[PDB]
Amino acid sequence: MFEARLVQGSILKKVLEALKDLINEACWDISSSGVNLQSMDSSHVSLVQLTLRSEGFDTYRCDRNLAMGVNLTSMSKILKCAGNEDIITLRAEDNADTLALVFEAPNQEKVSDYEMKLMDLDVEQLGIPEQEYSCVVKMPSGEFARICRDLSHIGDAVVISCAKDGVKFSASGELGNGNIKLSQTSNVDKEEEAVTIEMNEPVQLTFALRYLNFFTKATPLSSTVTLSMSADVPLVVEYKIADMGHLKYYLAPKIE
Amino acid sequence: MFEARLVQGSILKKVLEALKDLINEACWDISSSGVNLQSMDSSHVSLVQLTLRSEGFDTYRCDRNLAMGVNLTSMSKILKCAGNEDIITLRAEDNADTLALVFEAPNQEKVSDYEMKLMDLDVEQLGIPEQEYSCVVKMPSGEFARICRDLSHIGDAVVISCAKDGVKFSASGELGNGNIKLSQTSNVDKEEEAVTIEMNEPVQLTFALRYLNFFTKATPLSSTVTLSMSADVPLVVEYKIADMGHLKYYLAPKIE
Amino acid sequence: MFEARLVQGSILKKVLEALKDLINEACWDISSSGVNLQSMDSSHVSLVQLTLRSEGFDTYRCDRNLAMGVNLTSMSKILKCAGNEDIITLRAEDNADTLALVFEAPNQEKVSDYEMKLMDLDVEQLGIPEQEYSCVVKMPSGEFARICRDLSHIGDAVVISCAKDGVKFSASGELGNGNIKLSQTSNVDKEEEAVTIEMNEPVQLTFALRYLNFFTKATPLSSTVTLSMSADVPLVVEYKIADMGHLKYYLAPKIE
Amino acid sequence: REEYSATCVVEQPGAIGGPLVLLVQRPDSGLLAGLWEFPSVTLEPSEQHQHKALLQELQRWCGPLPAIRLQHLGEVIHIIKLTYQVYSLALDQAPASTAPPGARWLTWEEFCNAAVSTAMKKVFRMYEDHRPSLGQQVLDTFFQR
Amino acid sequence: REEYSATCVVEQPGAIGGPLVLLVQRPDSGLLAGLWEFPSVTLEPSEQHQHKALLQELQRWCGPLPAIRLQHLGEVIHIIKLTYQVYSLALDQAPASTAPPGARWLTWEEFCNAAVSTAMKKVFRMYEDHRPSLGQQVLDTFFQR
């Protein structure tokens, strides 16, 4: 018997919006720790890793570890029926082949309950070796979205440069090339609309803007984003979910 | 000689917006009482009934009962040229095969006058037996629109349940099913954002969400909507036009 | 060596937005006076004339008259990467076959520099005989846009009438016809949301609404627009760029 | 209002649980819209026995086929006035290339639990002789003239 | 600027008020855009008498037709430099299936009150010999080089 009550249902709506376009079907790992989801896209070029700690729920209960295969498209259609201010509740009984979703309007006038048919497929398990990244970049989420959107008009690949000074975004195409240089904000501070660089070794990596434009669909989750890189190592785009967990995207770089 | 002056021209814009997508051509009954319009869609599954009492006009004049066949698509294109704050005036002379529409900007700087070519087709007259409905449901117009929109992602048919407690909206499809239960608001009150149930016999009817999604295009007319049902009786979705009349939609239910 | 620094970069974004859809490629005349651009569309029916005086730039420098052929589509894609509050800088060295564009974010945290590959084509030079127009019409830019948009639903041609009283916009089509009469605002005044007519001889000209709907894409440049006409003389739609220059559209009328 | 139509049940051998049958999808607008049915074609009652319209429609849903098995069955009277002539076609192999978007080759059990019109329900009955499901209503029943 | 073209007036017997004629619609952009005219095809002056481009265009607007009536008429000089060779084709029956989207078979009175180019106005004049309407202008007339 698994039941999880989340007061801020907008979190769950945004999460499916951040996966629907990149992953069509994924497996949900439910346990005492919380919710975990790991899946690569069809091309095996990118991977998403969702973690929702149980402590971030109003109510949490899990009598048995569950492995739920879920059509993310179907689940987003259902979550579309939920209001941003609704209290969402996920429920999965022991001998039930379906997932129950209960949306509760704020003023208790309206109560919705859904039931998606659910599926199961043989999926492979991987691991992410938690290593030391040569350069960690923390920057506003909106700004990173604008950059990845803008350079998509110049070219289809982006070269991220790392140094102690700042981070550089470059792209080239038929019409020309462009360089977006973000300086290490040291005199601004104020809100977390700042840019901080923690650089060890200079990093120079190239990535596909198509996949990055799928990652920035997680922008509504967090005001900021962190990018982690190393020498010939997949990129880590991390979106923090408010004191509940995170949503990390992994993306493979290229070499000749 | 027919002339009708309406200060709030937005009413007429919204009305054509609420008919264009459902009815392509309809006949307009003009008389001393006001304006009346009755027409079914091509499939004969739904029907619209528009009533605009003459008392709701700034100026009204009708020397002869007129039966005007009007391409609603053409009339909406013309009404698109009117501003929400314009004073609209309809005029139809005796020996004129066209309808005159005069839009007057508020500050009198701009005056527009149009003339649609008008048509005529043989249409059949029906009647609506004003009967007693087993359950009348009054609810916010926006909420009813959200419900009909949301369940369209689950399935293509909706089952409306009636009881003394409340009203239930259910739908089923390939991904699963959902139930939207609206409680009888007795402790909320405040504005007309409340839900009131006047139930005699329990009603259970199934309808097509496609047609209902055409009805909710009349949402800007009224803050609330009323739904009337009976045992194996067409549905009455009524939209109140402010102290001028109403816009009623009729929709046939199904049985085996 | 040509360098031009413009604090209000929104001006340049709006200008390319006002040319992209009408002209695909054009030649840029750079000199000590400023920037000039003249080009007809493919059908030779309309012409655009852009003038940006050098005095309207924060910094201006031009050591050699330059004739730059520019793909306007490519330049708008690049200008899309600029924020409305960015300081745009155009730079063109002597022996450089590319145009440099530097976008500077307001708080100096972000600095972008682009480089479009640039092209060259043999284009013909024309001249506009600065003559006396029989009727000059000054009116709000938004209103002129609404008129040209609305009459596009009635017909594809518009007849502009001139007189001492006011200006009339008429169009006819399959559904009917319409007349938009704008009165000479003499009791309104207030802001430049007024309409002034300077009429000598009555003018009656017909134009294609398609091309006029390309001209109104320059609406964000100015709050007002001026229309100049004469007897069998191209139309002059003039958009004033704030103390920097203007953007004039020319459009040929018809006769049998 | 008299409306004349003509349908055909294209039958394929298939594998287990055969034989398989073709079924197209009705448009998303109109009377009895959205349901699946056998390929049909509307025509005037002056041409109530023409094979060209049917064979042309079958080519749009199956491609070319050797016209050497088009067999007549009977008459399906659907209660407008719908008059539908029921035909039958059997193929020795699979369709030309594949089922175009909109077609589904269901089995006998897959067809006895899907969704079709009450008119087509009487169409599958004549095919076997010679060998809670609701339907949208019409407002004409409640609003007389 | 020299531009070579070639048009043809496809004529059908029709019924009352005949004969009927085919007419395609010009694109919504360019010089004299939006008006209706007979099917035409642009080509280089090095190939100013080729029937392939015309017959191929006619098939796109009528389908296959027995090439047994393509008759030459004369030369239409339109004042770029437009040179158009005028042909003529007459059919004994109706088009192959129907008029594709963009075609209209108008009568003699239906054509004498529609909207065509001044070049096509001279095209219908040569066809009858052997048997307030405004037009968009060009800014080249006001802005000399």
Next chain:
Amino acid sequence: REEYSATCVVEQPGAIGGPLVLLVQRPDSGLLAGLWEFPSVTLEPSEQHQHKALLQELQRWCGPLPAIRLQHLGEVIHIIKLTYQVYSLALDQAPASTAPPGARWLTWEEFCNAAVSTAMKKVFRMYEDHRPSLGQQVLDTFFQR
């Protein structure tokens, strides 16, 4: 995961700098997406020598062609398990009508400086015998199972 494919290098005489070759564009999604390569067709290893799928694909990119020159070359092993059989076709003239949207007839120098897959790089090597460019990687190399 074993994946069987088969490609062909359609060669045209052309003019200067010949011979010319055809090249289609890969889809914008998947592994090595967006790059140009010779026309290829995926198939099961049970049908690893069929010409129908290749010749049908060539018709979609060139139209009909006299099947009188389809010559086998060798085997291209691409490191899933991609097995691609390399063929060759030479035409005596130009394509049927023109290159459909998505095709580009580049020269030898125009092809030695464009963008192709490392698998196709070995395909052009076998054709010449008998006569900084980066590529997207896969997360399987960093996340073992």
